[PDB]
Amino acid sequence: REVINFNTKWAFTKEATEVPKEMPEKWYWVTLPHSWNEIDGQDGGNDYYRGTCYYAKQLKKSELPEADCYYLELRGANASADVYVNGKAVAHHDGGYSTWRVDITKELTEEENLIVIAVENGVNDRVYPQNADFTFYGGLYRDVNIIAVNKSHFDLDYYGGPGIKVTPEIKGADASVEVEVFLTNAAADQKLVYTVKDAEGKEVAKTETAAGETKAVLSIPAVHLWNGKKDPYLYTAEVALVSGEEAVDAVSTRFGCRTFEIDPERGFILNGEEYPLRGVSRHQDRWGIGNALLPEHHREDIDLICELGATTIRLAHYQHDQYFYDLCDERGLVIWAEIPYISSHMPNGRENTISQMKELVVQNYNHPSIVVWGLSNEITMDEDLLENHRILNDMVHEMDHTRLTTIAVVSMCDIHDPYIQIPDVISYNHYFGWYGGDVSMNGPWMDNFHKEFPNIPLGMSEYGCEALNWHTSDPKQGDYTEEYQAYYHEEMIKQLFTRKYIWATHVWNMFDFGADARNEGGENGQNHKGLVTFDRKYKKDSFYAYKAWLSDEPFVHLCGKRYVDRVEDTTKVTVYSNLPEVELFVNGKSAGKLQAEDHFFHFEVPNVGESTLVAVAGEYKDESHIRKVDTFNEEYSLK
Amino acid sequence: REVINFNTKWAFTKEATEVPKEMPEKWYWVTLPHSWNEIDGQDGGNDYYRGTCYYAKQLKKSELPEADCYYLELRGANASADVYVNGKAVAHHDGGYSTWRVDITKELTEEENLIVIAVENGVNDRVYPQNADFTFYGGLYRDVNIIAVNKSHFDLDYYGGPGIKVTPEIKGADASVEVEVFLTNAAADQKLVYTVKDAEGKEVAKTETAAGETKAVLSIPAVHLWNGKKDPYLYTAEVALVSGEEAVDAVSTRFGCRTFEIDPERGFILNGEEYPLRGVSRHQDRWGIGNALLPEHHREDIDLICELGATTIRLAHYQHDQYFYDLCDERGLVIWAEIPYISSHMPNGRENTISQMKELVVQNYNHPSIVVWGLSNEITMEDLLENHRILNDMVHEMDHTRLTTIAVVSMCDIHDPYIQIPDVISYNHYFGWYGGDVSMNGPWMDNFHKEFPNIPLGMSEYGCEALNWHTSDPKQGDYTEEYQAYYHEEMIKQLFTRKYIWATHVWNMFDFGADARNEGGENGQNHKGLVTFDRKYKKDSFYAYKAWLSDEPFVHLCGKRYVDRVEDTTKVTVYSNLPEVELFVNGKSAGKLQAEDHFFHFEVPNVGESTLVAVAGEYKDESHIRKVDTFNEEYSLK
Amino acid sequence: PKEMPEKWYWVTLPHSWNEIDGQDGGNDYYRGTCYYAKQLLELRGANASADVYVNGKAVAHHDGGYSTWRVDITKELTEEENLIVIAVENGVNDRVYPQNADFTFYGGLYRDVNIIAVNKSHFDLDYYGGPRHQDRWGIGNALLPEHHREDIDRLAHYQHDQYFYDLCDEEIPYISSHMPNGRENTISQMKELVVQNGLSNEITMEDLLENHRILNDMVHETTIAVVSMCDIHDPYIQIPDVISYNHYFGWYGGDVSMNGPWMDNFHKEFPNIPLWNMFDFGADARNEGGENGQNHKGLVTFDRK
Ligand SMILES: Cc1cc2nc3c(=O)[nH]c(=O)nc-3n(C[C@H](O)[C@H](O)[C@H](O)COP(=O)(O)O)c2cc1C
Ligand SMILES: Cc1cc2nc3c(=O)[nH]c(=O)nc-3n(C[C@H](O)[C@H](O)[C@H](O)COP(=O)(O)O)c2cc1C
Ligand SMILES: Cc1cc2nc3c(=O)[nH]c(=O)nc-3n(C[C@H](O)[C@H](O)[C@H](O)COP(=O)(O)O)c2cc1C
Ligand SMILES: [Ca+2]
Ligand SMILES: [Ca+2]
Ligand SMILES: [Ca+2]
């Protein structure tokens, strides 16, 4: 089995009449990943181009390895797509976030075969998402491959799945691992060789069956538990399809061995031990390239999230890339995965909810980082809606006996609504202190639901506050300053991180992200609730509030480095640190030492002329600068 | 080559959760043709179910004659459809009105294969129609067939087309007919036997070539031209694919030999002679069954149109059934066919205009009745202009034998750029119904013909609503049968007298389904027909046209449903294509009229209960009236 | 040049600098940018590309050496003595037709250059200059009225001069090899040709189709001349209103006889589409026949004697 990368140099256009019959010569050249909304869907106006665009590329047999079948594999085509080979339609897919594939062997009738993929992200009542606070970036924004396999091969046709399904059971110190496999055009005389490998590639179990027996149970004695950030230990499972003495096809996947519970009072439990889930959410886009993300972009996002110290990520609002989920498995992050069943129940969207959720579970069952499947987000923003949830919830329980269902509930929805009783666990999306109200309401709002429903495990799946490069010494809801967002998250941390019954918390959001309908805060087309800016270059102060509570990397961080000119004669200077004591020095002389148990060191500092600020904790330091002015620098003010 | 009927007993549901793995047991049974909008799309409130529906049926290999390939053929799935064979997707189609086919041989692996067809007619920005005055009836509303063929066979995969393209050219008393054919998996050592046959089935031309030479030009000595209603003569081309001495596949099509012009001053011309196109439009639906029309329904519609004597039908607003177009060929009607590029240009809609026009032309090229392809209807009600330049060039590229046209909304400025694109244009004017006055129509047409003396100008729509309301004082907006008849009397006098109007089309021949309509006292219908929705009642306006267009002699008494009348002396209209009519009231002559325009306007004493007899030669009609003190408010909508 | 030149060569329009070296062989006629300077605007013939400068400032540029173009100058005439400079260029590029053809691309202001004095409100001047070969031995394309009349006593491959159509009263140079970046020039020269008064010649010696479709739609809102060996079922033949072929059977090999027969076969094939040179003319690449520099498929000599 060979995987050919197929991303290089497609002809692209937005204004093409019909499927072209010859390779276009005046189209725009893109190399996938590509989204055509990389600029117009990150800048405001809710006007990013939505419509059908064409990608065209020639497939030459002289470059393909010799093989019985060739499959076109699409990792991401947002939102709907059709595939033509030498002009004939061979495939249609609805769902911008999952892998789908098609056997194109029969249509490769020429030495040069025109491969045309039409991709559409228009408005309709059928394909989720339609109503949501993010840009539906159109395009082939994930890899396109060609898969060359033998006539008998592991299934490439079942909902974009890998063709292998690993299910570990923990029994004391050992593990029982069921490995199931799915075959296309297999012969009764072929064998299946199942192997499990160690983190160092060392074989630790091996068994064989006839091809008609597509399950096997392998034992792993003295199992290394996947145990989160403490030890994200991963095994590999391999199954080869063997004709006589030779492997004609092989599939593999990594997996981790763990149990968990979501206890309504003790919160998240992992392998029998309490394992608090304190984290963030992440969209799969980035400034300048839309959602056309490279592997290094996925690695940077998770590096920054690891540096903050999050033990969980909510991967809203749709299926992310396989490489990002692998990264979570490798790094020990606990993951919430969901489908874009969002904001507003579309009666005609029901088929597509089913479809996307099947692809979500089938394609991601093997990732040990995932513990919950999310059915919908804020879906109540009614009987048909309830039936859609029953069906999704029973299908997920049908397909996956080892994970729990959840929803993300909109702030205002009555806690006695019937759909809250449907999934195994729930979380709420609250913005008290940002969309009105006050940051102190969150804690008690959660306590009151907990009182009403003591057996429903309750998390916080969204909470957050907007912040851009604006500054103040009087932080207030709606000035959009870095300082108010810092205060907000300090207060959420204090309320949320001390309530063990909150099973998972997810800052909305880890990064600023694309939302073309947003036109607020001084910079349009973006939600700026991030802890880090859209291009990943600037960690806002609120990022270090969380690092001070969740990371064991010793550091000391000076807040307000961008708020330089201050009117006040004595100015507040906040330091965040996971060390026990910080000393602040103003132009070289101590303004005192503090010991903040909640890691929030609030100093008061004379502001005369220009001053250099140095904060010192053990052997770690940070530096900033302020200066005294008579009038407020109107460049700090959004108004 | 065997075509098997596959309409029989599908399981059907409106709840589109998932494609069922096994044949269902508590869905609803339907035999195609079928639309789920047959009731909720004909009754008002714009609320008919739009969404995804499932059809499920078992295909059993034993019941299939043996063959190398099996194609599923769908004649109509409205609007967008996906086909599954044993849970595997094998085709997708957008376009409620055209034939599409898929090879499914490779998926017939069980002895009982589960066919599932998902059909969707919801709201989107991509598939036409989305904005129009008619119900987008969801479903498998035309035949589904299994087509079993030999490994080598005429093309079944190209835009649903027949596999055989027939172009007659004429010069002098003879005809020359090019027959082109398209093959799938043919082998070099195979032959093509082409034949042309008489109306009586006698061979008139024959020739053999090798499977590689897929075009042939056969000659018809002393050809009988297809000449409209006067002689709708059809030949039949057949081509067989032969392996050795054995025909392994054959296709065929009827065709007609005819030339025509659309002269900007002389109007329509057919085989050199002026041939005026005065007629009607026709929607493909019927009260009670939606668009799930049977062949008997197509036959009755065309009978009623022939009885009226139309020489043309505008088959709005989309591709019609092949069987209806065949009737049109057989009866010598001259057809306008069009795609549902309608009301409002969708920027995301370009691709679907292209696909529907390709299918329209590929599947209907052989129909001699068809003279014009319609690009759009009221589309203005720059991306638009490009969209029309693409359609216009593509049709002109595909069909060198027919002209392009459009239907222009009423208020559209006559200098607008898009009017310059097609070969010919027509307007939809409703002066005298949607405001205005009926006298405006002819002069408006005169202005355009002055302003643009060489763009052939037709009237693609005009009409007036009518239900079972009556009055002795017809006014626009009373929805009375009497006002509609007056409107049509005046439109005939204005339109039928202007030779330069190349085609007139009454909107509409029949009342039809429009679920957003909520007026005239019966919601869910456009009541502008000459004939009611169940085809059971000919409104009086039907006869005003018949008197001008039919050669069957008749006399028709208007107002039969207006019995109770208050006035001592009442107006009684007779339509007849005979020169002279005498009308009798209780056996007493109330007057003798000759009317050149066939509209016999009598006045009559109204006393007691009276019986009316209209007499022209040996032809009579009969009606009854009654004198009443007060108006019968049952005759009144308000 | 800032000042009116002193040592340049004086010429009086019409003028081409290829009057001699473009009629004598070797395909070496001077092709490049040349300058005309005058003290003091409409140009009837500036082959092939030109820039007008008034007191030192560009005021108009034109590509197309066969059609009229004007530029309002009223505001640049700022002194009593105004230096008008016209740079004319007939070089090689992939953009301005013609580039490949059997005739000399005689450079210069080979037709009149007038000044038009107009009332402010006026019949318009600025919409594309709107209201046999054109050369002779010894003077290139710098023909005088007398040379038109003597010729009168098919106007390929370009717009001829207004006065000559008048002697007809009383096609663009889209020729030989299709130039992808030449699309705009065929458009501009077609808009010009039709406004102030043939789509292609031998252009096959899909982007090409798109170019024809663009031209045909713009003029209609038509004909081509087809190279001999072209394929009668080529898609582009079904684009214009009518077509005509060019055949040299019996000269470029073969026999005179194949011609009659040949056009018959076409007519049978396409029953619905209706199916050189008067004088010798200048073709500097021609090095055949003992007299190099002329195509001698002419009935009359180059000097019309
Ligand atoms: C995680 C997972 C992966 C699966 N992968 C495959 C597969 O690759 N090929 C296959 O034929 N069946 C696969 N199955 C089996 C299907 O679930 C099975 O066809 C089921 O009966 C169909 O129901 P569904 O439409 O809800 O998936 C998989 C099941 C699960 C839970
Ligand atoms: C009326 C008509 C019917 C046609 N039927 C077929 C056909 O059945 N099979 C086919 O391959 N091409 C058919 N063609 C078109 C030509 O063969 C066409 O140039 C080519 O096959 C595909 O061109 P495309 O890119 O437009 O699809 C048909 C064309 C016309 C005008
Ligand atoms: C033969 C002809 C001559 C024209 N002459 C002029 C003109 O002299 N001045 C003018 O403003 N428009 C003139 N037009 C303007 C037309 O309106 C023009 O073709 C079109 O409407 C828009 O022009 P555009 O190319 O600038 O978009 C002329 C049009 C034609 C067909
Ligand atoms: Ca935008
Ligand atoms: Ca209704
Ligand atoms: Ca020379």
Of A124, A157, A350, the CB nearest to B126: A124
CA angle, residues B288, B294, B296, in degrees to nearest 5 = 105
Q: Do C238 and B176 touch (CB under 8 A)?
A: no
Report DSSP letters for A442-498, one per residue: HHHHHHHHHHH-TTS-EEEEE------S---SS--TTS--HHHHHHHHHHHHHHHTT
Do B238 and B268 share a domain, yes or no?
no
Q: Give me the residue label for tokens 């996971």.
A: A578
Where does a domain end: A150, A177, A194?
A: A150
Q: Are A389 and A354 in contact, with CB atoms under 8 Å apart? A: no
Interface contact A89-B91, CB threshold 8 A: yes
Q: Both B350 and B404 in a single domain?
A: yes
C3 lines ligand 3 (CB under 6 A): no
* CA–CA gap between residue C180 and residue C90 (Å, rounded): 19
Alpha-carbon span B69 to A621, nearest angstrom? 78
Residues B442 and B480 in one domain: yes
Q: CA C263, CA C238: separation in Å to the nearest integer?
A: 17
- Spell out where chain A is interrupted, by the residue before each break (C to N > 2.5 A): 381
- Structural domain count, chain B: 4
Chain B residue numbers touching A124 (CB-CB < 8 A): 122-126
Same domain, A203 and A273: no
Pocket test for ligand 2, best of A17, A18, A19, A21 (most atoms within 8 A of CB): A21
Burial code (b: 16+ CB inside 10 Å, e: under 16) for A132-141 equals bbbbbbbbbb
User: Strand runs (DSSP E) across C180-234, as ranges?
Assistant: 225-226
Tell how far the Cα of B587 is from the centroid of ligand 1, in angstroms. 85
**Which of A13, A21, A26 is most worth mutating to test chain C (most C CB atoms within 10 A of its CB)?**
A26
Asked if A25's CB is within 8 angstroms of C180's CB, the reply is: yes
Degrees to nearest 5, angle at CA A628 with A622 and A633:
100
Count of Cβ atoms closer than 10 Å to residue B58 Cβ: 16
Q: Which two tokens stand for residue C44?
A: 């009837």
Per-residue 3-state assignment (H helix, E strand, C coil) for A125-167: CCCCCCCCCCCCCCECCCCEEEEEECCCEECCCCCCCCCEEEE
Show the tokens assigned to A542.
């609120």
Residue bearing tokens 């005055």:
B133
Q: Measured from the CB, is residue B161 less than 6 Å from ligand 2?
A: yes
Distance CA C295, CA C287 (A): 9
A26 touches chain C (CB under 8 A): yes
Q: Look at ligand 3, atom 13, and give the residue with the nearest C-alpha.
A: C127
* Greatest Cα pair distance in chain A: 88
Whole-number Cα distances in Å, B549 to A202, B267, B499, B543: 92, 17, 15, 9
Closest among A451, A395, A445, A446 to A423, alpha carbons compared: A395
- Are A70 and A164 contained in the same domain? no
Residue numbers after which chain C breaks, C to N beyond 2.5 angstroms:
40, 131, 153, 170, 197, 205, 221, 275
B403 with B423, same domain: the answer is yes
Tell me how far apart the 2 most distant CA atoms of chain B are, in Å: 88
* Token pair belonging to A241: 């399809």
> B294: which 2 tokens?
């049977």
Tell me how many degrees the CA angle B395-B400-B406 measures, rounded to the nearest 5. Answer: 45
Contacts with A149 (C-beta within 8 Å, 6 or more apart), sequence order: A1, A67, A68, A69, A71, A156, A249
Question: What is the residue range of A565's domain?
Answer: 555-639
Nearest to B281 by CA among B324, B314, B310: B314
Helix (H, G, I), strand (E, B) or coil at B493: helix
Domain co-membership, B131 together with B265: no
Distance (Å, rounded) from C-alpha B487 to C-alpha B138?
35
From CA B548, how far away is CA B487, in angstroms rounded? 15
Contacts 24+ apart (CB under 8 A), C165-174: C165/C197, C171/C198, C171/C199, C171/C200, C171/C201, C171/C223, C171/C225, C172/C97, C172/C198, C172/C199, C173/C66, C173/C97, C173/C98, C173/C101, C174/C97, C174/C199, C174/C200, C174/C201, C174/C203, C174/C215
- State CA A529 to chain mean position distance: 16
B323 and B278 within one domain: yes
Question: How far does B88 lie from chain A, in Å, by closest CA?
Answer: 9
Work out whether the CA dihedral B98, B103, B109, B111 comes out positive or negative.
positive
Ligand 3 within 6 A of C130 CB? Answer: yes
Same domain as B265, residue B121: no
Can you say how many angstroms the Cα of residue B549 is from the centroid of all Cα atoms in its chain? 19
Give the dihedral sign, CA A273/A277/A283/A285.
Answer: negative
Is the domain of B479 the same as that of B359? Answer: yes
Regarding whether A21 and A60 lie in a shared domain, the answer is yes
DSSP state letter for A635:
G
Residue A22 to residue C207, Cβ atoms within 8 A = no
Closest alpha carbon to A425 in A316, A310, A504, A345? A504
Question: Do the beta carbons of residue A242 and residue A192 sit within 8 Å?
Answer: yes
Same domain, yes or no: B285 and B219 = no
Are C263 and C231 a contacting pair, CB within 8 Å? no
Tokens linked to B155: 């093309």
- Residue pair A50/A129 in contact (Cβ under 8 Å)? The answer is no
Q: What angle do CA C84, C87, C90 make, to 5 degrees?
A: 155
- Please tell me the experimental approach by which this structure was elucidated: X-ray
Return the ligand number nearest the Cα of A46. 4
**Cis peptide bond upstream of A317, omega within 30:** yes
What sign does the CA torsion over B344, B348, B350, B356 have?
negative
Among B95, B122, B150, where does a domain finish? Answer: B150
Describe the strand order of the beta sheet including B164-171 as a list of residue ranges. Answer: B164-171, B174-181, B215-220
The contacts of residue B457 (CB under 8 Å, 6+ apart) are B264, B424, B425, B426, B427, B445, B448, B449, B500, B501, B502
The dihedral of CA A545, A547, A549, A554: what is its sign? Answer: negative
- Tell me how close the Cα of C156 comes to any Cα of chain B, in angstroms: 28
Count of CB atoms within 10 A of residue B605's CB? 15
Out of A238, A378, A483, A491, the active site residue is A378
The pair phi, psi for residue B107, each rounded to 5°, is -100, 0
Task: List B627's β-bridge partners, or say none.
Answer: B565
Rounded distance between C-alpha atoms, residue A142 and residue A98, angstroms: 10
Phi, psi angles (nearest 5°) of residue A499: -110, 100
Residues in chain A: 639
Q: Which residues pair with B338 in a beta bridge?
A: B374
What is the number of the ligand closest to the CA of B290? 5
We report the CATH number of the domain holding residue B277 as 3.20.20.80
Question: In the 8-state DSSP scheme, what is residue A66?
Answer: P
Distance CA B574, CA B567 (A): 19
A461 contacts A502 by C-beta, under 8 angstroms: no
User: What does the buried/exposed string (b/e) look like for C210-242 if buried means 16 or more CB atoms within 10 Å of the residue's CB?
Assistant: ebbbbbbbebeeeebbbeeebeeeeebbebbee
> Which residue of chain C has the CA closest to A21?
C206
The Cα A236–Cα B553 span in angstroms is 90
CA of C135 to the centre of ligand 4 (A): 58
Q: Which of A499, A523, A554 is the last residue of a domain?
A: A554
Q: Please give the distance, rounded to the nearest whole angstrom, from the Cα atom of residue C196 to the centre of ligand 3.
A: 11
Yes or no, beta carbons of B125 and A126 under 8 Å apart: no
Supply A322's token pair: 């396989």
- Cα C138 versus chain centre, distance: 19
CATH number of the domain where residue C113 is located: 2.60.120.260
User: Strand, helix or coil at A517?
Assistant: coil
Nearest to A82 by CA among A108, A117, A50, A113: A117
Closest ligand 2 atom number to CA of residue B358: 26
**Residue ranges near ligand 4 (ion) with Cβ within 5 Å:** A 40, 43, 45, 47-48, 516
In this structure, are strands A312-315 and A277-281 parallel, antiparallel, or unpaired? parallel
- Alpha-carbon distance of B75 to B33, in angstroms, equals 10
Residue C194 Cα to ligand 5 middle (Å): 56
Structure tokens at B514: 């429009």
Site of tokens 């929705």: B533
